[PDB]
Amino acid sequence: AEAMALLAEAERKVKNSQSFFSGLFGGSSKIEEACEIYARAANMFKMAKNWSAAGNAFCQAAQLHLQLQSKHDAATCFVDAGNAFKKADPQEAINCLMRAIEIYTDMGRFTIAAKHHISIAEIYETELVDVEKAIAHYEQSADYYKGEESNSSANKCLLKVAGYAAQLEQYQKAIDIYEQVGTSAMDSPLLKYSAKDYFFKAALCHFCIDMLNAKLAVQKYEELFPAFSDSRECKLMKKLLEAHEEQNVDSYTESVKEYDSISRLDQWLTTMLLRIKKTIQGDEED
Amino acid sequence: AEAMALLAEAERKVKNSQSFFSGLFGGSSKIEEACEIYARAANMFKMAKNWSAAGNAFCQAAQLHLQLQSKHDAATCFVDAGNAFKKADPQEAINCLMRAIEIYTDMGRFTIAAKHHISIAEIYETELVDVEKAIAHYEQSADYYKGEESNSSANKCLLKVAGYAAQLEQYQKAIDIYEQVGTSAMDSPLLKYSAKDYFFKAALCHFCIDMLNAKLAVQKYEELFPAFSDSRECKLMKKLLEAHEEQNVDSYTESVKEYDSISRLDQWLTTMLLRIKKTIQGDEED
Amino acid sequence: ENSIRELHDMFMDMAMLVESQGEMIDRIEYNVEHAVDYVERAVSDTKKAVK
Amino acid sequence: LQQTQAQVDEVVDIMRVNVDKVLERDQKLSELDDRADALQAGASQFETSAAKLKRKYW
């Protein structure tokens, strides 16, 4: 219960012994008791809905637990310190997880480093928006997930790179990413149906390109075009290529006049719609 | 061959001794042997179809482990004791599920705490009808599931809150729930075809809320009104709440069946529909 | 259209059901490596408790 | 139209085969939780037991 007395009785109990207090063995029993109690204390603040004070209570517990010698669960206390300000409003969970991930990889490990590097990336994408750094976090983290054949996040965090990167700034990465996912997507008997929208994303990114480079993917890809769900990928394209190439808008726009009913359009698709018609503006708008 | 002998034989041995029976050591190996006898006893009580002394046997088996070194497998035995009297009719299990909460909540294990904190409300509503405490535990547990950001566990709690805020008739809080959860869902393809279900669930929660918030929450949630389950929400709602503004129940009751012709109604909706139909009727007299 | 509506009922059931299951998969995502984060980390000290 | 009626009603029954699946889906989604929840404590407490062990036999 004590929000303060566990602290006050442990702060007078944390001290290095070169004195009459030294004696025979260390005070590692004392700081072990203290850090277990700090863990309970950061629990009682989080139970009391104090995720800032609780999160800082995790921060002392999480930093002081390394002082005996415990890098094992000090990483867990770092994640708990991160989860508190991740749940609470502000930042500084970013530092709890950057203290976490380096120490976790310093154990001789790979996975959870990436599994919270994505957490920092989610914060720096959604919340503490630093997408030019979060996308690097997805990138290096997906490099770790690639080097462990955890193909899930290996494809996923790359998709998070490319879906925002293409629209904002990186163009050859768009098709290079959606082809790297697309080949091994065609490989597995589990994956080759997810490849349809993956090559849709490879195609409909136009990179200031007026061409049928999407049709280069058509006469590349294993569509099996009697599968009509790729006609919402490329017959869409077989209209709009020549709509954009004949600088025409009442066929290009008509494609989504009919395609909005047969497919709900999210923000990224309509932003790419607006992207290719900014290329149409640059073809038409004087 | 039953464990009623095992309980008394370990109860001879459970003494807190001050004699040569301790000597210098206690009964540590002896009391682990004893708690193993209680473990075996409490298992074969459930094996013997007892269901009433069995969960008591788990209670006591854990009870003689609580004060030793570790409440932890004793806490799991309390979880098992909560799984003991739950199938049975007695209420002893809920108390053991409290004991598990103030071990796992007390220790930092909010995850498993939230795993059975929901089952407590499942018993306070389904079995042991105390539904305002059931709802207070769905809400509290959803606060915990949002503590670790496990969202849809909390949303599955919030339907039992909010869906049972209809018959508890706090419509003002029913519409306070589906907004922040469903406007968070249009970015998710995971639930977007479901999200408009929730803004039928937001929309039809009337205490006769005749503001254009119902005409605007359908718009902030950007929603193609020619969506074909929003045809089953939006223009449905237009006929349902224009006829109320016509003060004319007959074409209302014909068109609610016209909705039944194209999407059959279920319990929570149908009950709220006859509810709001009472409001429409009691408004059309005067 | 009614027959396709019947299968459409079974399919909105299907897809939103497996959707809802995806949250139990989220609790797996907890209990798949946090389970490792306890276990492998504990055996990093029991295997080294021989030291 | 009736050719398509027969085809589509076969596909009603393909969805009924998905209904034959979905109980086998959901029960297994249940029992895998019914193991993972119970696995969590046995996974959790073993590092604590390791700490209890290794303070002595240096």
From Swiss-Prot, chains A, B:
One of its GO terms (cellular component) is synaptobrevin 2-SNAP-25-syntaxin-1a complex. The modification Phosphoserine is found at S19, S22, S188. GO terms for biological process: apical protein localization; brain development; intracellular protein transport; membrane fusion; neuron differentiation; positive regulation of ATP-dependent activity; protein-containing complex disassembly; regulation of synaptic vesicle priming. The keyword Transport applies. Coiled coil: none annotated. It comes from the Eukaryota. The keyword Protein transport applies. It is a peripheral membrane protein. Keywords: Acetylation, Cell membrane, ER-Golgi transport, Membrane, Phosphoprotein, Protein transport, Transport. InterPro entries: NSF_attach, TPR-like_helical_dom_sf. Gene3D superfamilies: Tetratricopeptide repeat domain (1.25.40.10). GO terms for molecular function: protein-containing complex binding; SNARE binding; soluble NSF attachment protein activity; syntaxin binding. SUPFAM superfamilies: TPR-like. It is found in: Cell membrane. Required for vesicular transport between the endoplasmic reticulum and the Golgi apparatus. Together with GNA12 promotes CDH5 localization to plasma membrane. Belongs to the SNAP family. Interacts with PRKCABP, and disrupts the interaction between GRIA2 and PRKCABP, leading to the internalization of GRIA2. Found in a complex with VAMP8. Component of a SNARE-like complex that contains at least ZW10, USE1L, RINT1, STX18 and NAPA/SNAP-alpha. Interacts with VTI1A. Interacts with STX12. Interacts with GNA12 (via N-terminus); the interaction promotes CDH5 localization to plasma membrane. This is Alpha-soluble NSF attachment protein. It comes from Rattus norvegicus. The lineage of its organism: Eukaryota, Metazoa, Chordata, Craniata, Vertebrata. The gene is Napa.
Curated annotation (Swiss-Prot), chain C:
Expressed predominantly in cerebral cortex, hippocampus, cerebellum, adrenal medulla and retina with weak expression detected in non-neuronal tissues. Phosphorylated by CK2. (Microbial infection) Targeted and hydrolyzed by C.botulinum neurotoxin type C (BoNT/C), which hydrolyzes the 253-Lys-|-Ala-254 bond. Cleavage inhibits neurotransmitter release. Residues 1-49 form the t-SNARE coiled-coil homology domain. It is found in: Cytoplasmic vesicle, Secretory vesicle, Synaptic vesicle membrane; Cell membrane; Synapse, Synaptosome. The record marks K48, A49 as: (Microbial infection) Cleavage. It comes from the Eukaryota. There is a cross-link at K47, K48, K51 (Glycyl lysine isopeptide (Lys-Gly) (interchain with G-Cter in SUMO)). Part of the SNARE core complex containing SNAP25, VAMP2 and STX1A; this complex constitutes the basic catalytic machinery of the complex neurotransmitter release apparatus. The SNARE complex interacts with CPLX1. Interacts with STXBP1. The interaction with STXBP1 promotes assembly of the SNARE complex. Interacts (via C-terminus) with KCNB1 (via C-terminus); the interaction increases in a calcium-dependent manner and induces a pore-independent enhancement of exocytosis in neuroendocrine cells, chromaffin cells, pancreatic beta cells and from the soma of dorsal root ganglia (DRG) neurons. Belongs to the syntaxin family. This is Syntaxin-1A. The chain holds residues 206 to 256 of 288 of the full protein.
Curated annotation (Swiss-Prot), chain D:
Residues 1-58 form the v-SNARE coiled-coil homology domain. Nervous system specific. A higher level expression is seen in the brain as compared to the spinal cord. Expressed in hippocampal neurons. It is a single-pass type IV membrane protein. It comes from the Eukaryota. Keywords: Acetylation, Cell membrane, Coiled coil, Cytoplasmic vesicle, Membrane, Phosphoprotein, Synapse, Transmembrane, Transmembrane helix. GO terms for biological process: calcium-ion regulated exocytosis; cellular response to insulin stimulus; eosinophil degranulation; establishment of localization in cell; exocytic insertion of neurotransmitter receptor to postsynaptic membrane; Golgi to plasma membrane protein transport; hormone secretion; long-term synaptic potentiation. Residues 1-58 are cytoplasmic. It is found in: Cytoplasmic vesicle, Secretory vesicle, Synaptic vesicle membrane; Cell membrane. Part of the SNARE core complex containing SNAP25, VAMP2 and STX1A; this complex constitutes the basic catalytic machinery of the complex neurotransmitter release apparatus. Recruited to the SNARE complex following binding of the SNARE complex component STX1A to STXBP1. This complex binds to CPLX1. Interacts with POPDC1 and STX4. Interacts with VAPA and VAPB. Interacts with WDFY2, PRKCZ and PRKCI. Interacts (via N-terminus) with KCNB1 (via N-terminus and C-terminus); stimulates the channel inactivation rate of KCNB1. Forms a complex with WDFY2 and PRKCZ. Belongs to the synaptobrevin family. This is Vesicle-associated membrane protein 2. It comes from Rattus norvegicus (Rat). The chain holds residues 32 to 89 of 116 of the full protein.
